[PDB]
Symmetry: none
Subunit: 204 residues, 2 copies
């Protein structure tokens, strides 16, 4: 990379790097300032409290600064490594503590398919090729949001976008594309709701 850079002049700050911790289950952002660091590619790696990679979304603001956002779905410490032109910036890694909120044990689960409710709770089987709506009623759980991750039979872990209804309930829309074992993790305020993670088998 002939274009000169100096990663030691990059500065990072903002809510997503708060040394006092952040609330789990809420998306958060921070700013990376490379205006004095020359020209190079900015990369960010985030490891979650389980040591697994977490997506850091990077917005180039076109002025030498970047906005980075991530979703700490999980209580615990996240490990953030930032590189400019391939070189680590100072003071790495950032260790950011996502703190639990509310009472996940008060969340209730109902399931519906095609506009017909299967009543309460998520049994051990789901159907393939059929949109399934898992409603998490958190009206009694207090502070926090519902988050969801699905592991597919191939081993991939995918964060599912949870719809907030603003009445204390949250809807998880999922269509299982293939038969096999899925693991559906549902947290509220950073913590597993009752019976999560759900080990479910997708069937014809």
């Amino acid at each position: 990379p002939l274009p000169a850079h100096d990663a030691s002049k990059v500065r990072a700050s903002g809510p997503g790097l708060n040394a006092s911790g952040i609330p789990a289950s809420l998306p958060v952002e921070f700013t990376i300032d490379a205006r004095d660091a020359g020209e190079g590619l900015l990369t960010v790696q985030i490891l979650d409290p389980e040591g697994k990679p977490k997506k850091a979304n990077i917005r180039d603001n076109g002025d030498g600064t970047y906005t980075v956002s991530y979703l700490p779905d999980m209580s615990g410490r996240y490990t953030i490594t930032i590189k400019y032109g391939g070189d680590e910036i100072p003071y790495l890694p950032f260790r950011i503590h996502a703190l639990p909120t509310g009472d996940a044990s008060k969340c209730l689960v109902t399931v519906s398919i095609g506009g017909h409710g299967l009543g309460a709770c998520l049994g051990p089987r789901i159907q393939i090729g059929q949109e399934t709506v898992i409603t998490v009623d958190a009206k009694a759980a207090g502070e926090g949001k519902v988050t969801c991750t699905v592991s597919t039979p191939d081993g991939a872990e995918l964060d599912v976008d949870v719809v907030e209804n603003h009445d204390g309930t949250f809807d998880i829309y999922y269509t299982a594309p293939e038969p096999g074992k899925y693991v559906i993790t549902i947290r509220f305020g950073g913590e597993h709701i009752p019976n999560s993670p759900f080990h479910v088998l997708a069937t014809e």
Copy 2:
């Protein structure tokens, strides 16, 4: 009116040193024919250290048939006394072994003939009969068992009816308002979504 508990002998499937299958009722025999006259008592603690019902039948001949239901996989600690005195070699430690695959069980709940889908829901009405059906066709060897924790903190075993087609029915009515915890196991292990937390309301 003398007795000698040191001469009481104990044997049978319920005391098998190699373990017993969880979720199946089991019996054992206490032989006090050489031990004189006295009252037989049996205490069973389940793996969590809580009392487990021991049904004692006096056979009227110096022997007793004792039965208990190991609903939970794990270790059961059995203390037997005759005339108030311990018999030898106590306590007995009996392993209840898991069987089958409780994770393959399917639950359906019906109240007054209306299906509530899987699990109870957060609320039921006091005095209203509930029917919990457990489909265990895919679960392998074992039986469904059920224990309820009541608002007062008591534990009660709820009889489970075997239909001999792979399904089991549980009939339960909440008598008092408050929080209940319904534990449903197959072959010693929680079925999916057990234990079930329900508030009994007016």
